[PDB]
Amino acid sequence: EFNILLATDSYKVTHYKQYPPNTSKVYSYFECREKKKYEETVFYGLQYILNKYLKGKVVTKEKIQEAKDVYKEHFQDDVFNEKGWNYILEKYDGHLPIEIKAVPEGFVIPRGNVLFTVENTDPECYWLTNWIETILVQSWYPITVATNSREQKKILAKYLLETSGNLDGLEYKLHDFGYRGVSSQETAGIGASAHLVNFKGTDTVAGLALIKKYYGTKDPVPGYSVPAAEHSTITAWGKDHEKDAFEHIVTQFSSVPVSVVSDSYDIYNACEKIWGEDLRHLIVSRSTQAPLIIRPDSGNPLDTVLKVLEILGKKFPVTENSKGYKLLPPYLRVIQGDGVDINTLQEIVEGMKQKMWSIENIAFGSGGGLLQKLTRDLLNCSFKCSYVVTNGLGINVFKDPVADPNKRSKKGRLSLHRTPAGNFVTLEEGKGDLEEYGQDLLHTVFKNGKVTKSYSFDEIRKNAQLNIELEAA
Amino acid sequence: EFNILLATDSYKVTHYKQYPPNTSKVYSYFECREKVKYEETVFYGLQYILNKYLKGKVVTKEKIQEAKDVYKEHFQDDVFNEKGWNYILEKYDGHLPIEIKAVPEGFVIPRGNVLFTVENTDPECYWLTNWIETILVQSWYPITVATNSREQKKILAKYLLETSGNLDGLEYKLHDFGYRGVSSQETAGIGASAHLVNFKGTDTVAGLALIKKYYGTKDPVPGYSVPAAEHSTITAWGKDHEKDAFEHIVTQFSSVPVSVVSDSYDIYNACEKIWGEDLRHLIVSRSTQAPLIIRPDSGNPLDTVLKVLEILGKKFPVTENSKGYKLLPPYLRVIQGDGVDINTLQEIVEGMKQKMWSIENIAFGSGGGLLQKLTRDLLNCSFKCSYVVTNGLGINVFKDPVADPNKRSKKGRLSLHRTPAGNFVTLEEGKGDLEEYGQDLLHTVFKNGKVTKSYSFDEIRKNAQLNIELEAA
Ligand SMILES: O=C(NCc1ccc(S(=O)(=O)N2CCCCC2)cc1)c1cc2cnccc2[nH]1
Numbered sequence A: 001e002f003n004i005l006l007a008t009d010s011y012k013v014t015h016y017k018q019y020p021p022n023t024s025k026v027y028s029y030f031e032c033r034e035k036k037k038y039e040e041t042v043f044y045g046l047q048y049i050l051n052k053y054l055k056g057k058v059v060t061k062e063k064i065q066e067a068k069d070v071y072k073e074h075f076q077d078d079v080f081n082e083k084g085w086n087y088i089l090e091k092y093d094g095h096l097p098i099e100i101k102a103v104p105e106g107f108v109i110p111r112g113n114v115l116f117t118v119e120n121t122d123p124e125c126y127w128l129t130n131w132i133e134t135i136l137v138q139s140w141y142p143i144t145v146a147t148n149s150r151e152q153k154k155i156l157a158k159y160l161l162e163t164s165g166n167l168d169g170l171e172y173k174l175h176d177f178g179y180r181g182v183s184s185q186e187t188a189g190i191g192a193s194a195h196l197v198n199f200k201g202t203d204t205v206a207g208l209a210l211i212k213k214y215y216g217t218k219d220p221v222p223g224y225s226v227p228a229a230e231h232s233t234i235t236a237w238g239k240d241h242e243k244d245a246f247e248h249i250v251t252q253f254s255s256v257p258v259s260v261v262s263d264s265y266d267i268y269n270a271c272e273k274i275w276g277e278d279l280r281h282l283i284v285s286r287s288t289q290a291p292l293i294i295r296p297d298s299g300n301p302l303d304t305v306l307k308v309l310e311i312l313g314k315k316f317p318v319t320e321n322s323k324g325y326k327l328l329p330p331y332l333r334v335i336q337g338d339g340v341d342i343n344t345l346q347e348i349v350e351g352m353k354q355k356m357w358s359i360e361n362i363a364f365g366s367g368g369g370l371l372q373k374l375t376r377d378l379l380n381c382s383f384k385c386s387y388v389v390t391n392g393l394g395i396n397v398f399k400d401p402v403a404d405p406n407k408r409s410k411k412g413r414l415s416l417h418r419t420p421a422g423n424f425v426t427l428e429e430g431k432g433d434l435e436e437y438g439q440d441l442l443h444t445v446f447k448n449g450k451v452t453k454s455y456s457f458d459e460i461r462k463n464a465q466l467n468i469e470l471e472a473a
Numbered sequence B: 001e002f003n004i005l006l007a008t009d010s011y012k013v014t015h016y017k018q019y020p021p022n023t024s025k026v027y028s029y030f031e032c033r034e035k036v037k038y039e040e041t042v043f044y045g046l047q048y049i050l051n052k053y054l055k056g057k058v059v060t061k062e063k064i065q066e067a068k069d070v071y072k073e074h075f076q077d078d079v080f081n082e083k084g085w086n087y088i089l090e091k092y093d094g095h096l097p098i099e100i101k102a103v104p105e106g107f108v109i110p111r112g113n114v115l116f117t118v119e120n121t122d123p124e125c126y127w128l129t130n131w132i133e134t135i136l137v138q139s140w141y142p143i144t145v146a147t148n149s150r151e152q153k154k155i156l157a158k159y160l161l162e163t164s165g166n167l168d169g170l171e172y173k174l175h176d177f178g179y180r181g182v183s184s185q186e187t188a189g190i191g192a193s194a195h196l197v198n199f200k201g202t203d204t205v206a207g208l209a210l211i212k213k214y215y216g217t218k219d220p221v222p223g224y225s226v227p228a229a230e231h232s233t234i235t236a237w238g239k240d241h242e243k244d245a246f247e248h249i250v251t252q253f254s255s256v257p258v259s260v261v262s263d264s265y266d267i268y269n270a271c272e273k274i275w276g277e278d279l280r281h282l283i284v285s286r287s288t289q290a291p292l293i294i295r296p297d298s299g300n301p302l303d304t305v306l307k308v309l310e311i312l313g314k315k316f317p318v319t320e321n322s323k324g325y326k327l328l329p330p331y332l333r334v335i336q337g338d339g340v341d342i343n344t345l346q347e348i349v350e351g352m353k354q355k356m357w358s359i360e361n362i363a364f365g366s367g368g369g370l371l372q373k374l375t376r377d378l379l380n381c382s383f384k385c386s387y388v389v390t391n392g393l394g395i396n397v398f399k400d401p402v403a404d405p406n407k408r409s410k411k412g413r414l415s416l417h418r419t420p421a422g423n424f425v426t427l428e429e430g431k432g433d434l435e436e437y438g439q440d441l442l443h444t445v446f447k448n449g450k451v452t453k454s455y456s457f458d459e460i461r462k463n464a465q466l467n468i469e470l471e472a473a
């Protein structure tokens, strides 16, 4: 079972001996620190952590003894605030005397703004605020996945709008292929759920249960997929029988969309000769609601996409849409799901545009790029103490390393506000109390072991919409 | 609760319908595909997956119903293999009729070798082999962390031996700071455990319980830490009281090692004037078993380390070791734990060597670089079907994409062997059966719901030792 006493960086076990004597309050905050582009971030994932790890009775006698036993060996020394933890157990029935205030989930906030704050609600538990730094800072991950996914949606929206005149199907244009490529089952669920803030297509099934448990949707599920082959279901037929494999598969899934990986041996041959000649009669008969989606999976992504489209455009009836861009017939589409990240996605859609191919023709699958190739440095997600009370006096505290002004942290009690022009500003040094800037946008989401404010996945999705979506009404 | 029926890529739900009719066996394998660094990989982490997720009764009536309900909404259609999963439940009491063979954990194997194989043991369950691809492929993560950690150990060993003449303390020279910088709690434990294959220093407490539960050590714990400050325990004292914080902290931890982050405002001032003058008397009085470890945490890593050492070298009594390199007194050391990855580690130790500073003086901490900034592409960890039986005939199968020969997969039944020169070779097409290369070095580790062979963490560490450690001993 999970033990919050064992869920911190080892050194934090020793910090209760290090703060100034007579310190009754430690107040800390999280931001995606500005760096002298990901100019705005989607705030998402805290509610998962609050419910899974922080709420309710998280301290027990057994957990205290377990931590004591572990740390004695880990440090080869007895340092461990058994008294402090036993206080929480006795006084609060093991509930954390912590208050967390946060911007609503799904909110899109520029870099360098307070996103949430943490403070102890009992003077005895001054040490607890930063104990939980480690677990709270892991919110960097769903924030970063959601943010990077949204930035890809902006790119897709721009090019889909330009090449087609509308945004139909935008929410299915970037599909999560990342289940195998992340570091754990837990990561899979978290990361997949973050992608679903922006899109509705996923193969990372773990995301669905997480959303159902911690967030909730009006719809039965938040994400969808369709049948598709993998290399094993093609290659199992034998090298000389790729055509047999293709035929069997599209016939099995004749009335739903089906994607078939086509590069097992020679993608160009498969497109031109197998799909474009031998099995063409099985493709041109398909419903618009049940297209064949051809999947290349190797070679230079842009070069391969363009050559696949050129091949298909010569074997199937291509139209020109009202924007002047080429469009495959509705029973035929392409998905590129190899080597896709935010940079290559941009390269591919731009290359398609240059060659007059509509983005209507293609969807993207992304695995490691979407869910694994991200770090806490991308948005500089960081937790710092900004205010303490010692001997009954509040003092504004911060770091400001001489050799790196980018690591300077904020001072004092913080609040987040709308500016007169409708932007965001973080007020420092308790200046929000002056009330010159309207209401603090941070809301209490956790207090004394209870989750006090929750958001549905539908609300989060609404908050995270693109402007271009808002503009398209 | 975890449900293996919901722990696969969505499209795999539909694959049972796509294999050739009358297929009785699907046989697949995992390798770190060859493409130059990372020439050899540490095989580690499969045992965790087998025990946590694959063994025992993993199918229940309730789990089948849950999957059925989820997939009906997810696909907007009924495509789920209820019958196939029910068969496993009825016939094998929900134990997976799968056999997995693997190289021993901790083994160091060159790229492009078979590391494990998977096949079904019941003809009805031909579809099961690749169902579990997704969860098995996640072994890429502990393999990659362990491998990259070991590659850093090689660098540290080279430079420690060169500058000091021995490898004393090598196993404490790279400390895991990655807990806050990984994507989940589960990942933290897995990744920390993989680092501990090579080193004994960690702050990622999650790794300890994982090792104890799934692997085991003779020692009470597999990893260790010491007391240390963070910026909040310095800055809380107020900007004008950095000296007071430092004094309090080293006095609280007067008889054990203690690390104190020294860059909150001015690292160079802290080293030269606070440590080197005002508090010098509290440092030179300390035991060799209880050094102060000064932690810079900002600026260019190499430049900052060099400047820190030059400062300390003028304030404290430096010696010259038997190799001619400069050595701080034993009560004083440095740890650089900002911006450290395998590349910057190399740059720092090389820069120190050029300036005649012993590697004895320094240790490194690494967080995101150690545990998060890694993907499945680094070692090309990949799972592929290589053999099938259909209509009673075995067929050697593979992919070989025309535009990427690096993605060609192996053909047929595989086995791992020692060559006459004592190296590893992977034999394809069942050629292991010819017995020209001795016995297969893979061991059956899982069969029909049971783990059949396992390794303690102590054995894994032994298997993963560096040659230079083996030669030294
Ligand atoms: O093909 C796969 N999944 C199915 C899939 C096919 C096509 C689309 S689509 O976006 O073209 N589309 C969505 C709206 C309905 C029209 C088709 C989305 C999803 C798949 C490949 C892969 C590789 N690695 C890991 C996991 C994987 N799953």
Ligand SMILES: O=C(NCc1ccc(S(=O)(=O)N2CCCCC2)cc1)c1cc2cnccc2[nH]1
Binding pocket: A009, A011, B172, B173, B174, B175, B176, B177, B178, B201, B203, B225, B226, B227, B228, B229, B257, B258, B259, B293, B333, B334, B335, B337, B363, B364, B365, B367
């Ligand atoms: O200081 C920290 N931990 C304690 C620590 C200090 C020094 C060493 S050491 O290797 O120098 N050493 C071990 C052999 C005995 C002599 C000292 C190892 C461990 C710490 C910083 C940090 C930042 N981010 C996240 C987590 C973190 N923990």
